Swiss-Prot record:
Post-translational modification: Phosphorylation at Tyr-62 regulates FGF2 unconventional secretion.
Record: residues binding heparin: 16
Entire protein: shown range: 154 to 287 of 288
Effect the entry attributes to changing residue 33 to E: No effect on integrin binding
Annotated site, Important for interaction with integrin, chain positions: 108-109, 114
Name the record gives this protein: Fibroblast growth factor 2
Source organism phylogeny: Eukaryota, Metazoa, Chordata, Craniata, Vertebrata
Subunit structure, as described in the record: Monomer. Homodimer. Interacts with FGFR1, FGFR2, FGFR3 and FGFR4. Affinity between fibroblast growth factors (FGFs) and their receptors is increased by heparan sulfate glycosaminoglycans that function as coreceptors. Interacts with CSPG4, FGFBP1 and TEC. Found in a complex with FGFBP1, FGF1 and FGF2. Interacts with FGFBP3. Interacts with integrin ITGAV:ITGB3; the interaction is required for FGF2 signaling. Interacts with SNORC (via the extracellular domain). Interacts with glypican GPC3.
Motif stretch (Cell attachment site): 26-28, 68-70
Primary role: Acts as a ligand for FGFR1, FGFR2, FGFR3 and FGFR4. Also acts as an integrin ligand which is required for FGF2 signaling. Binds to integrin ITGAV:ITGB3. Plays an important role in the regulation of cell survival, cell division, cell differentiation and cell migration. Functions as a potent mitogen in vitro. Can induce angiogenesis. Mediates phosphorylation of ERK1/2 and thereby promotes retinal lens fiber differentiation.
Region: Heparin-binding, residue numbers: 108-124
Tissue and organ expression note: Expressed in granulosa and cumulus cells. Expressed in hepatocellular carcinoma cells, but not in non-cancerous liver tissue.
Protein source organism: Homo sapiens
Subcellular location: Secreted; Nucleus
Signal peptide: none
Amino acid sequence: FPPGHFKDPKLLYCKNGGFFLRIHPDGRVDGTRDKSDPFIKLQLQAEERGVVSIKGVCANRYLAMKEDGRLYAIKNVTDECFFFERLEENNYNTYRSRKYPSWYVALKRTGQYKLGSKTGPGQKAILFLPMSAK
């Protein structure tokens, strides 16, 4: 197979409570502290420069942000599935919706997602550290 065929999985660790982003088979998105959870293994695929999509390996669904700010995961990629990936001062990344460019992927400290319209650049909720899934 040509280069890039097999995608290297990653975890996304949210600084706000220390949860790994989790994508469930039914499309729900939340966080968990169990590093052995099969549903936290993600593929971060580079799309255009500085933009990624985020796929749950086991759920086989793409992270998307809906026009009402809700986070969910869908089986087929749409324009709601693309995020600007920006490196931050504390070595974490942020993921900002390309379709709705004031809104970020984010978790509350309960482990539930934070509505996109409530997010913003200074929040702990939007900070994710890519980690090895090995």
